[PDB]
Amino acid sequence: GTTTDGMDPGVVATTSVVTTENASTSIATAGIGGPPQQMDQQETWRTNFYYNDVFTWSVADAPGNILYTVQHSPQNNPFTAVLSQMYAGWAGGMQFRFIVAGSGVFGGRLVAAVIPPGIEIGPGLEVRQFPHVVIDARSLEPVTITMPDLRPNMYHPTGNPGLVPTLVLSVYNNLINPFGGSTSAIQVTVETRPSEDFEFVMIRAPSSKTVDSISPADLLTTPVLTGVGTDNRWNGEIVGLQPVPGGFSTCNRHWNLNGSTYGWSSPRFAAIDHDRGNASFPNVLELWYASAGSAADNPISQIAPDGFPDMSFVPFSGITIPTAGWVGFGGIWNSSNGAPYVTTMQAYELGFATGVPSNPQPTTTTSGAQIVAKSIYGVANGINQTTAGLFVMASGVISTPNSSATTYTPQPNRIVNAPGTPAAAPIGKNTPIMFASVVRRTGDINAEAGSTNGTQYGAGSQPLPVTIGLSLNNYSSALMPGQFFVWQLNFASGFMELGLSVDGYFYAGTGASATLIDLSDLVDIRPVGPRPSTSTLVYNL
Amino acid sequence: GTTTDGMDPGVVATTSVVTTENASTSIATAGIGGPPQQMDQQETWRTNFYYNDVFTWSVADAPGNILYTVQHSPQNNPFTAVLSQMYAGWAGGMQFRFIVAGSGVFGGRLVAAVIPPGIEIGPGLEVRQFPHVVIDARSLEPVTITMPDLRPNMYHPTGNPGLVPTLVLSVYNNLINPFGGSTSAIQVTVETRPSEDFEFVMIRAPSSKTSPADLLTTPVLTGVGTDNRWNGEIVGLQPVPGGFSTCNRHWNLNGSTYGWSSP
Amino acid sequence: YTPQPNRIVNAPGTPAAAPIGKNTPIMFASVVRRTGDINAEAGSTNGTQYGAGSQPLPVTIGLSLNNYSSALMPGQFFVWQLNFASGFMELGLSVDGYFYAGTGASATLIDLSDLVDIRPVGPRPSTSTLVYNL
Amino acid sequence: GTTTDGMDPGVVATTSVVTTENASTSIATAGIGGPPQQMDQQETWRTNFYYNDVFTWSVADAPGNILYTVQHSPQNNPFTAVLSQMYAGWAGGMQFRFIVAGSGVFGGRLVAAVIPPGIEIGPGLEVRQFPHVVIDARSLEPVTITMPDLRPNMYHPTGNPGLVPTLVLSVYNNLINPFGGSTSAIQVTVETRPSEDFEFVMIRAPSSKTVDSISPADLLTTPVLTGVGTDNRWNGEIVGLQPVPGGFSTCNRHWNLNGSTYGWSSPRFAAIDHDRGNASFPNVLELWYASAGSAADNPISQIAPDGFPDMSFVPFSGITIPTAGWVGFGGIWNSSNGAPYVTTMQAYELGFATGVPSNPQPTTTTSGAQIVAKSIYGVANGINQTTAGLFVMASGVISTPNSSATTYTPQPNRIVNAPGTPAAAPIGKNTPIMFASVVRRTGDINAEAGSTNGTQYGAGSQPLPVTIGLSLNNYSSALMPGQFFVWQLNFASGFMELGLSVDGYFYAGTGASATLIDLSDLVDIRPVGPRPSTSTLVYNL
């Protein structure tokens, strides 16, 4: 009993949803796709159990609290997911093996049940009023539960499988430690193998693509966060994760799971170039400005030229240097022939401001606003032109008046967004986060990391490869409204979960904290899949 | 071999998607719509092949180029299209007969395969990595390919069938004319015939509605219609190589306008 | 023919029509009066004056009344066939509402006097050259 | 005979290498890995033939010329390659089916043979002095030839399989057309399926990595060249391929297939920053310079700071504007505290030059050279300092004196390389090529594409994702010295082949032409695999 082999299911527990009629009907209806494939019952990939997930069980969990959910899918087994790349459909059930690492002195019970399709999974689900099985905290041998395929279709297409059942495990009775003390939690391991009636149909070419994508599993791979990927605002290597308990919004260079964007930029960093604008200087500070909604040459949107930052404008004059402003190197060029005014090359600051023919005032709404660029240093010689063009670089820096570092920018109050942009708000104990990278500052252009003058961090909403992938492929059917697609980040000490919504914002289970999370100890990233958005993500750091 | 009657299929080429299990399951599951209709196996409209389409095969077609492709539908047969006006559902397969009008001196081969539902059809689709059949340009007798009804639903409603399989014919090897000259293309004729398991269900009214074809009719351009800027009878078409733009009294295919005038 | 492309005034956000391979956007040309000679209509010795429009009026009315937002995918043309006495030609319509013909880089006016009938064809890829057998 | 089904092998032709002893020995020795997996003989993926490649046969091919080669590998079948992701070893042979699209009036014969391991494949191989089979050009039914597994190991590991045999098809007699005329070529199609003794052993986790990589197949994927990937010198979207008949060399931001580089930059674009240098100006042009071999803060190499361009310096003075020079926006900063001299912000030109305390002279050797930056426009006010720092952006532009466009730069004579850098030279009809992107020019900063003033193209040696992949993973065993890893680029009209060597240079079969190849009509990229470097690549455009 103390030793378990890979082919041992332990105690077999069944519920009222495992019937002969269901199996016979599933097998009969699956025949529309031809004879079943991969039915050799002596293959190693079919006979052994393989790891799926591990979750914890604490004494502070009240009865009815959900500890583990999983949606029926071939992605729940390492070898069925690989085999799914060469077939167009699948059918059948799966077996789930649970091992409880308890002791003989503990108390409490767990309950498991199968949820039929069409029922929402959340805090309002009463698992104990379904056909169910009860497992004690003192169980020694593993317990296996079978999830049948309850489907309204003849078979599940690889692209869009349709409606599938769900398996939920919740607390039946509180875990109790008679001694008390600091030991108040145990762990449960889940393992899976396909049932005897699982099958594939309709072999297909591996290079062909399904109308609808399986799932955005490949968007967030380890190189994206281990030092190769960069953020979508400052184009710098991501080095940390910054929680945002207040909440924020972002639309510039930001895609959702429907192949649409609310900004004006493309998933790249290319020189900002506009042709028609008003330039004047009434060592002098050149001031160029234009009206929003006039970028007729930008096909994505007309709000601003492609690449224009979505930060507010910080007023400044004379010797005073603005703090936390977006600065790019460039200048003015003659809109008549395209030639550049060589005497205006300098590091300008760009932003969105309203009513600035004379009075600079910051704004965060693109409706009825203006785009303003103003040099922070004296140019060689000023130019007065009614119509002139602006040419700036897209990879900017942060303006600071001294060598000291400031808080991460842009702050949530500095972000400028188009109307209709959805917002990210905390959900229970799940908080939206931003990706933090290291950026240069004008006060000290030599401090990068570990300097005595402090470290400066810029923030972005999505990684650049993730944005490119969301802008290329379609993921409008992989996730339902109200669920998070969860990946697992594995560090040297513990691990954490990272969720992605349908709007494109990332969430972590950091609660109300705001301390930056370091990614130096990251080892690898493992996808998990769809989970309810009201389930707290694991943060074991 | 030089004479073919209306009931001869010719050479029956089989693909792995054609199985007895599929036909049996389709017949069993189609019963949800009631007893099958138009299922007599001795009717004249079911036993014969009838013309559907024709396409051209040139020596300039590179391998992989698609020459013919149709989605599974009752519209692929002249007589099932007529009967589909009074029925609301259908299920079953269909056979396709191909006759190549070549000669004994030509070279080149074609490839045909059936694409399962849920897979995008386009230039990136590699037909030759699916189970397929190779047909030579010197074929004297007709070759028949059967498309089975692979579907995740119980039946196909006429309003919206859903996911359906697709038949694709593409170039396997280039057409070769040893003599060269001006003769550099041949024709291929396609005829169809329903399978033994095809059926209709759920009779409906002929005048029941489930494209912008009627927008541009002959009177619009033969002397009755007028332009949207000067209100004068259209008499010519002027190309604009440079390109232009227009929003006043101009509507797109989404029921919206960017101008300020009414039609 | 007027208005020339540089004379057209448009609101911001209006999409433009550009050549696609060998497919060129076209305008519909009609006969209009001029103040200098209000008697010349067609075949006059003083020349013929042509005005230009973007869409026919019945087509505009139909597009403004009914919904066609699902009949065509982005990147395809709905093609009709115009049959003349000698040969035929293809005419494509996009989602933005502009008409295209396979006239290449030519700019000569096409006469509609010999038109006999119009036959619809349907959706086709926008990168496929339209047949101009005239 | 005119119709062939997917399971029909046609005429079965055998040679002296297909023996009972070989099969029995292979089956017996494969048992060290346990029972064989995936042996179900009725599976669709085993019973059908699937497409491998298509090649042409011309009347101008002399006898003994090689038309088709393939190396024994599970990558030669679409479904065995997928299944190889979950197993640690394989053994067995493969069947190859050939179809000739000939006619009854043609003449000529082909010859096929199996080459045992350890024999070089090239123009010096006499195929007709091996056991072989002869195929006529008038063959109607397909002909199938079996390649047995002739291996010195018990089984082939997935990572490093070892020595394997090769299949070669060459001309036996010239193809003849009795009518003559313009018809002088026919086509041959090759298809594969596994033999009855093919097997897998030792199932493994799909997420585990093999010590040595299978093959660099995923380095060059369609998004890299369809509009997402960028070059490694100008960071611009690749839009064309430029042949280089003369030959060139490149080491800055360029990796080989051994995980090593000869340059000084990392696979990224980050601001160029150096601390110690001599700045002087004896509207004035500021001139900063330093000695090479003094970048102690750069861990990759000490030749130059990371990101410094590898182009030569073009002398200029007064009003004259240098042509085809690398220009970046930036300036001088105080090395004492890191503060920047705000009056020196301008667009400088950077380069390598020798002996420039007074006389500018270009150079192309980093040994005993100097790095020189000089502003091309007058700064607000000059600064004289014995020690000062330089801060420039890494995404530069091309300097031109007017609005006209020039040839693609840098030219092969302008590239600066470290000693020991291997060169790329034409091999028969295979010519090294560069990746061409669109870059801005100072004379006209508004012309991008299709402008009346001309188009300016910058050139790079490798795509950025390819460089990153080569710098992360190990490919030192996938390719032997003297072979090219070939991908296929499929356009609307025809296709082309692209080869990659061990040094990291790309080759195309464009011969002695130098016209730019457009990538607008590209549809998809299909890997092919290892091929002899002396075999001409197909260029059917």
UniProtKB/TrEMBL annotation, chains A, D:
Its main location: host cell. It comes from the Viruses. InterPro entries: Calicivirus_coat (IPR004005), Rhv-like (IPR033703), Viral_coat (IPR029053). Residues 1-276 form the Calicivirus coat protein domain. It is found in: Host cytoplasm; Virion. One of its GO terms (cellular component) is host cell cytoplasm. Keywords: Host cytoplasm, Virion. Coiled coil: none annotated. Capsid protein VP60 self assembles to form an icosahedral capsid with a T=3 symmetry, about 35 nm in diameter, and consisting of 180 capsid proteins. A smaller form of capsid with a diameter of 23 nm might be capsid proteins assembled as icosahedron with T=1 symmetry. The capsid encapsulate VP2 proteins and genomic or subgenomic RNA. Attaches virion to target cells by binding histo-blood group antigens, inducing endocytosis of the viral particle. Acidification of the endosome induces conformational change of capsid protein thereby injecting virus genomic RNA into host cytoplasm. This is Capsid protein. It comes from Rabbit hemorrhagic disease virus 2. The lineage of its organism: Viruses, Riboviria, Orthornavirae, Pisuviricota, Pisoniviricetes.
